[PDB]
């Protein structure tokens, strides 16, 4: 994938003000609530019985931070997103058996969440930059199939 320079800078500046824990818990809570089947992969987490249960849950919040953090690894390495996610991909495809459509789903949610914390600051060029980033991370993870 080829990164424009205007694009590197749009992903890079936004990134630098993201509260990873705030968006993390949120991305992930919304993934569980909005696409309820993803709940299955996360059942080790305890009570996911209602929406409130879900935004109530410590692990949901805590694992949200972990995720967003892993986005950081890509933003650190836009030219090597391929190998950043290569161990994360084994786990997601092999072990946990996640359908790659779900990464698309979390990347779309991610973007709704960044919209909502950054307002007019989450510019049309800027959203196009991010949609491509999450597109990429997702294919990065999805490598381990085809």
């Amino acid at each position: 994938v080829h990164w424009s320079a205007e694009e590197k800078q749009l992903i890079t500046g936004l990134w630098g003000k993201v509260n990873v824990a705030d968006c993390g818990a949120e991305a992930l809570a919304r993934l569980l609530i909005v696409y309820p089947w993803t709940q299955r992969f996360f059942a080790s987490f305890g009570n996911l019985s209602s929406p409130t249960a879900i935004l109530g849950n410590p692990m949901v919040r805590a694992h949200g931070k972990k995720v967003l953090t892993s986005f950081g690894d890509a933003v650190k390495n836009l030219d090597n997103i391929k190998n950043t996610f290569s161990q994360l991909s084994e786990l997601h495809c092999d072990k946990l058996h996640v359908d790659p459509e779900n990464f698309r789903l979390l990347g779309d949610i991610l973007i709704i969440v960044l919209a909502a914390h950054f307002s007019k600051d989450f510019t049309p060029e800027c959203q196009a930059a991010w949609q491509k980033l999450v597109r990429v991370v997702a294919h990065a993870l999805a490598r381990k199939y085809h």
Binding site: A29, R30, I33, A116, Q127, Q131
Partner: protein, 141 residues
Amino acid sequence: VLSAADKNNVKGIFTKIAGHAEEYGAETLERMFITYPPTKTYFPHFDLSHGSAQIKGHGKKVVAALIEAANHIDDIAGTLSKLSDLHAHKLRVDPVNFKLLGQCFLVVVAIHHPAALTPEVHASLDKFLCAVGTVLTAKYR
């Protein structure tokens, strides 16, 4: 399908948008065209440049239609079927495209009214967006 609790959520957030239906309409469409450039291919006759006014009044139509389905939210399919013919048959629009617009509608909702796209709202909202997508893609399935 759309439960009672969804239909409030939807109704509620629409009450809160309403005013801005033309601006949201147009930012929705602009963002779709910068983010999903293959989508322009269907508007070959538009001034697709920022600000254009065909965008402005197309995006008025878009969300007015949606606003409309919201008031007869009980029978969306009935309400919107005038738009299938055109979308499915005439324009032959790829179903992917509806998720796309739909996603950009949610982003516009989120920049202006983030406090209201609560996650429980977001979900009612996506169900509704699918329902719409489904009726315009209709007379395929």
